[PDB]
């Protein structure tokens, strides 16, 4: 019932993207 | 460079999501 | 329910998106 | 280049949404 | 139903756009 | 160019929405 | 029941909008 | 560059996924 994220970057890297989704589909 | 994000649900969560991208289209 | 996101820039940007959305499909 | 954002709710809600984007030459 | 957002500029700034919405619609 | 707007609601509402952006025209 | 909004603008030309609304549509 | 990510099922695991790319295209 509970998510938690982070991204934290220490160097010049190309494109970056993150996604992230949460549900119950049966 | 830097972001952080975090959800936090008491009852109940029916449906969440999260996306983020850097250096889109230009 | 409660939801919260932080951005925080260290060197340069250019083209960036984020966003977020809760409750959804069960 | 430093933005913030938080939501609080009190009981429950239909559905919160939030997106942002910067920018930089246009 | 509460919800606060807040943005800082260095400076010079343009095709920075930002919108949330809360209660709006599954 | 800093702006900041916060809302606060007593109970009561259908449905809070805020938007804004920078670089363009008034 | 209070809600609060503020903006300044400065950097360079004009060229910026916001707007706020509460209680939309159940 | 650093990165982390959690979620809980809330008794499934299967109607909720997460995904991310780091680096992706130029």
Same mark, same amino acid.
């Given at each position: 019932q509970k998510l938690v994220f982070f991204a934290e970057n220490v160097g010049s890297n190309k494109?970056? /993207? /993150?996604?992230?989704?949460?549900?119950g589909v049966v």
């Open positions: 494109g970056a /993207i /993150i996604g992230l989704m949460v549900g």
